[PDB]
Amino acid sequence: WYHRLSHIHSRLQD
């Protein structure tokens, strides 16, 4: 589901 988008932002964040 849509919560998987947070994985793309965390890849840059940490």
DSSP-derived secondary structure letter, 14:
-
Distance CA 2, CA 14 (A): 20
Distance CA 13, CA 4 (A): 15
Q: What angle do CA 3, 4, 9 make, to 5 degrees?
A: 100
Q: Which residue has the tokens 């890849």?
A: 11
- Helix ranges (DSSP H) in 1-14: 6-13
Distance CA 7, CA 14 (A): 10
The separation between the first and the last C-alpha atoms of the chain, rounded to the nearest angstrom, is: 22
Distance CA 11, CA 8 (A): 5
